């Protein structure tokens, strides 16, 4: 008679109501961590680890989910870090409210393919309207655009101070790693900034190290820990005793030739260490291993040798100091040449005190003048929060300098799109106009969440918010009310042009493209079959 599957089958409006409650179970979590009045959470594990964070990606990655519609919204937050980097609480609330308003349409016996086709006409029109209603590029504002866009990202986190201490350190970090490319591409690789953590003084003592901050120790306590006018030798091979390979064995037939082979394992080893040290090299960085026999040659000659450094840290030092990453001997059948003209340069390599640990600093690197940020917090829970908040702040200034276009934040984009799409649904709307009209109400949840978390008036402040944006579209008298946002500290609509509340363009363009595409896949689960777990057979 029925289906003889050994799992479970649920059809109809059961799964159509379960996917909305699965998406609302995720959105109601992250609704309390949006905007400058948002608050952080606690993520306690079974082993006892506590993670205090408010970013939309760190919470949903550590949180376990079971529903298939819940894994779509959790993987939607992971894509926002790679594509944009701060846009990762706002996408989850929009994509869940896109399913909440579309559930009210399919309960009115409206076909979901008209809602899918109605959402594509509203998503492509939202990108078209936001690209024709921008204020200015990065020429008029200058450095004031980079600082004000950085403070908007920090307002939802622990580094949202009233001053410009953390804002100036981010702009000075991205501007110091300007790496040009072919065909006129000024790239800004923000992954080259080594963000370090140390439980020390307050947040106002966060050092901006112009150069690189290596997270390693010297090793042997007989080397000079401060070298002025240093020459960095970046190399990746273990400075240990000469061990033969698997194909080579030592089969001796004469007992007199025994001790000459035993001394040869250290003579070939020390032959490399004397030709890399006679060329003026004082700092040697190694990703392999330097044993206790080879540490004597640096104490005797007065050189610094750092062992077991990361491979991702050696590439950031050799590119910034002009050093060449050498793995072995080379240069056309040469015995030991080392190409001594390709040594790195540094002004000062100094191991400072980082509150009961050792940290090596390189000052200005003499070639590229890179930057590294050492964070200072109260405990380890604040340092993990300060690292995530700084990494999201580095991604904001990266997209502004690459794509010179900013949009007003604080719900100013979602207020203008809530009224333009209602007029867009009336012109060319015959049967898909109800999906475009619900696309505007789903976008209004971003200024609605700012009024809930601020404990302000909800149905009056957003009603006063769209009152200025309606007069900016139907009354062409140059009212300039396209930048009207929210003042959550006062509870009144303010102008985000003069207040300095700036967000990048692709933090909302890619947010509206990812949330609309995720809402289509969850809208097509009218039939769902769940099989039994095959564990013990």
């Amino acid at each position: 008679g029925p289906l003889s599957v050994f799992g479970d089958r649920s059809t109809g409006e059961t799964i159509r109501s379960q996917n909305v409650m699965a998406a609302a179970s995720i959105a109601n979590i992250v609704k309390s961590s949006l905007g400058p009045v948002g608050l952080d959470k606690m993520l306690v594990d079974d082993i006892g680890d506590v993670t205090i964070t408010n970013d939309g990606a760190t919470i949903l990655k550590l949180l376990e989910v079971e529903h298939p519609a819940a894994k779509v919204l959790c993987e939607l937050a992971d894509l926002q870090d790679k594509e944009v980097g701060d846009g990762t609480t706002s996408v989850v609330i929009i994509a869940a409210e896109l399913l909440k308003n579309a559930d009210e349409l399919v309960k009115q016996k409206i076909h979901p393919t008209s809602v899918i086709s109605g959402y594509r006409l509203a998503c492509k029109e939202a990108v078209r309207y936001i690209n024709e209603n921008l204020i200015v590029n990065t020429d008029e504002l200058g450095r004031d655009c980079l600082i004000n866009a950085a403070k908007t990202s920090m307002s939802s986190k622990i580094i949202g101070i009233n001053g410009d201490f953390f804002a100036n350190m981010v702009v000075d970090a991205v501007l110091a790693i300007k790496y040009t490319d072919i065909r006129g591409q000024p790239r800004y690789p923000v992954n080259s900034v080594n963000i370090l953590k140390a439980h020390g003084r307050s947040q106002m003592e966060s050092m901006l190290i112009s150069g690189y901050a290596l997270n390693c120790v010297v090793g042997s306590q007989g080397m000079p820990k401060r070298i002025v006018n240093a020459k960095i030798a970046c190399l990746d091979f273990s400075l240990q005793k000469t061990k033969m390979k698997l194909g080579v064995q030592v089969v001796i037939t004469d007992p007199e030739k025994l001790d000459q082979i035993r001394q040869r394992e250290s003579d070939i080893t020390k032959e490399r260490i004397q030709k890399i040290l006679a060329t003026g090299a004082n700092v040697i960085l190694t990703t392999g291993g330097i044993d206790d026999m080879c540490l004597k040659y640096f104490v005797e000659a007065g050189a610094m040798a750092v062992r077991r450094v990361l491979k991702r840290d050696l590439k950031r030092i050799a590119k910034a100091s002009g050093a060449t990453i050498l793995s072995t001997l080379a240069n056309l059948e040469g015995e030991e040449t080392f190409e001594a003209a390709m040594l790195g340069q540094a002004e000062e390599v100094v191991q400072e005190r980082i509150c009961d640990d050792e940290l090596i600093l390189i000052k200005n690197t003499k070639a590229r003048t890179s930057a590294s940020i050492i964070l200072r917090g109260a405990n380890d829970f604040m340092c993990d929060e300060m690292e995530r908040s700084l990494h999201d702040a580095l991604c904001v200034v990266k997209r502004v300098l690459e794509s010179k276009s900013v949009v007003p934040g604080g719900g100013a984009v979602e207020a203008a799109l809530s009224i333009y799409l209602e007029n867009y649904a009336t012109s060319m709307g015959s049967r898909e106009q109800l999906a475009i009209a619900e696309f505007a109400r789903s976008l209004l949840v971003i200024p609605n969440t700012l009024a809930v978390n601020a404990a302000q008036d909800s149905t009056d402040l957003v009603a006063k918010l769209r009152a200025f944006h309606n007069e900016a579209q139907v009354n062409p008298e140059r009212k300039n009310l396209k930048w009207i946002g929210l003042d959550l500290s006062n509870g009144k609509p303010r102008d985000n042009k003069q207040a300095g509340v700036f967000e990048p363009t692709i933090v909302k363009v890619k947010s509206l493209k990812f949330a609309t595409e995720a809402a289509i896949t969850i809208l097509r689960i009218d039939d769902l079959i769940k099989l039994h777990p095959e564990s013990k057979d």
């Binding site: 008679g1 029925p2 059809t11 109809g12 379960q18 409650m21 699965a22 609302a24 179970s25 109601n28 529903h67």
Partner: protein, 535 residues
């Protein structure tokens, strides 16, 4: 999600909702059809004169072989609420008419099978149910076209015997197909009130005793009770019985209240002996002064009163049931007397051969009343080879007693053997085109389901269903439609008027009416709220 909210709170609506079962879907209507078709496919093989019986085993281990559709569905342990409505459908046909209890379940399963293909085409289930009411109305009006009977209950019992042979032809009484059919005709006409057209089945006592054969079933005009002569030397044959029916035990009169009679002297104790000695001589003389020679008593006898019956030549039975003596006073024309002082010659019953008959080696000795005088109560004595053939004959002959009762309620007949179902299927197909606006597909599903009952007779008779039904249905359109059906041995031609296959009009009128309304209550349901396990 279920049992949890989006804010983390537990979401409990009803108690024990984890062990519940709820289906709305599109398979909730599909689960009702597949549960009802398996009941109709079971009862399809037990339809017609070639219908094979079914063996039913009770919970106590008792085995009863039944063929009627009322007792088959009633003795099941089906815990399915859709199939439980098919049990009450066959019970409602037995309580009202009592002949088509098998055919009303195959017809209801046929209407649901034709509605399954109509459900996949997008038709609403109430729209099919509203289309079946407009289609069953045509089958009622077309069934009243050819209907006539000439029963006068004097000498024209020939339409009454042939009507009962159609009901008894499908049972296991075909060896007594002419003998037992005449028993059920004369048993109704002697007890029915023709002035009110009312038949009382309390006057027709159906008793059974193992032994003999099926041909030894006789219609005893009178009563058959278990004779309990307290004296073993009582005469076992009374030629002319003046029956004295009484309801007082042969004892000194005991009151209904607490007495605690006091005895003080020895003159009061000697007065106790003379009080009871004259009381047993008074209760015996008051029967003999009325001229009675037979006594019936509901309660027990005393040992002192037993020998006084033999001295006065007065046979008497002991410990008769409640409604058993109620049948004696009607069969003999006497009156039931409460006391002994109210006995008279006018309250005596008249009977002829009053005797007890021993059956083989048993010690039952039932009463046989041969002669009577204008009795309004008869008793059928069913004999057989085992208790399986007797309890079925009690159920088979009860269906024969009901079809004679339906002829007194309505003297209009039809012709069975599938002849009325093919003729009614042509009436719905002719009115499906007048007009085919909305309910065209619902009326054609009704006419295709009315043809399941005659094609089930062709399947049980070893013929082909679609070959035989196409021949009979085409002959009713090329000429005026006769009583044209089928049979098992086929009796030569297929004319039901010549083969004397006669069924009642109101029997088939309630087969279409009850199956349509039961289909409407199982099509107009879109949810099931059954629980899970028992505990």
């Amino acid at each position: 999600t279920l049992a949890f909210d989006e804010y983390g709170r537990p979401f409990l609506i009803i108690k024990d909702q984890d062990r519940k079962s709820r289906l709305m879907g599109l398979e909730a209507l599909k689960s009702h059809i597949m549960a009802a078709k398996a009941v109709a496919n079971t009862m399809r093989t037990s339809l017609g004169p070639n219908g094979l019986d079914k063996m039913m085993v009770d919970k106590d281990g008792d085995v009863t072989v039944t063929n009627d559709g009322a007792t088959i569905l009633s003795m099941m342990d089906v815990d399915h609420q859709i199939a439980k409505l098919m049990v009450e459908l066959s019970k409602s046909q037995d309580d009202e008419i009592g002949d088509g209890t098998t055919g009303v379940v195959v017809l209801a399963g046929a209407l649901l099978e034709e509605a399954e293909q109509l459900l996949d085409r997008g038709i609403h289930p109430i729209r099919i149910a509203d289309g079946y009411e407009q289609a069953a109305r045509v089958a009622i009006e077309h069934l009243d076209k050819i209907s006539d009977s000439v029963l006068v209950d004097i000498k024209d019992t020939e339409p009454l015997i042939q009507t009962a042979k159609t009901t008894l032809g499908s049972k296991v009484v075909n060896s007594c197909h002419r003998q037992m059919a005449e028993i059920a005709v004369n048993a109704v006409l002697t007890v029915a009130d023709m002035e009110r057209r009312d038949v009382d089945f309390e006057l027709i006592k159906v008793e059974g005793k193992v032994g003999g054969r099926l041909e030894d079933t006789k219609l005893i005009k009178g009563v058959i009770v278990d004779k309990d002569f307290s004296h073993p030397q009582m005469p076992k044959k009374v030629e002319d019985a003046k029956i004295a029916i009484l309801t007082c035990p042969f004892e000194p009169p005991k009151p209904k209240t607490k007495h605690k009679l006091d005895v003080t002297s020895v003159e009061d104790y000697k007065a106790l002996q003379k009080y009871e000695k004259e009381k047993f001589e008074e209760m015996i003389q008051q029967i003999k002064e009325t001229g009675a020679n037979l006594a019936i008593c509901q309660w027990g006898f005393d040992d002192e009163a037993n020998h006084l019956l033999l001295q006065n030549n007065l046979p008497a039975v002991r410990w008769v049931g409640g409604p058993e003596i109620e049948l004696i006073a009607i069969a003999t024309g006497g009156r039931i007397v409460p006391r002994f002082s109210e006995l008279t010659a006018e309250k005596l019953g008249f009977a002829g051969l009053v005797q007890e008959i021993s059956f083989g080696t048993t010690k039952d000795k039932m009463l046989v009343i041969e002669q009577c005088k204008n009795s309004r109560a008869v008793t059928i004595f069913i004999r057989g080879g085992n208790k399986m053939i007797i309890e079925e004959a009690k159920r088979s002959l009860h269906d024969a007693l009901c079809v004679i009762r339906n002829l007194i309620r309505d003297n209009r007949v039809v012709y069975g053997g599938g002849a009325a179902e093919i003729s009614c299927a042509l009436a719905v197909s002719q009115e499906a085109d007048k007009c085919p606006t909305l309910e065209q597909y619902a009326m054609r599903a009704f006419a295709d389901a009315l043809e399941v009952i005659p094609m089930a007779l062709s399947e049980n008779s070893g013929m082909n269903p679609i070959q035989t039904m196409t021949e009979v249905r085409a002959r009713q359109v090329k000429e005026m439609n006769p009583a044209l059906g089928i049979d098992c041995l086929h009796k030569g031609t297929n004319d039901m008027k010549q083969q004397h296959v006669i069924e009642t009009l109101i029997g088939k009128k309630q087969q279409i009416s009850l199956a349509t309304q039961m289909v409407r209550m199982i099509l107009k349901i879109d949810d099931i709220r059954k629980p899970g396990e028992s505990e």
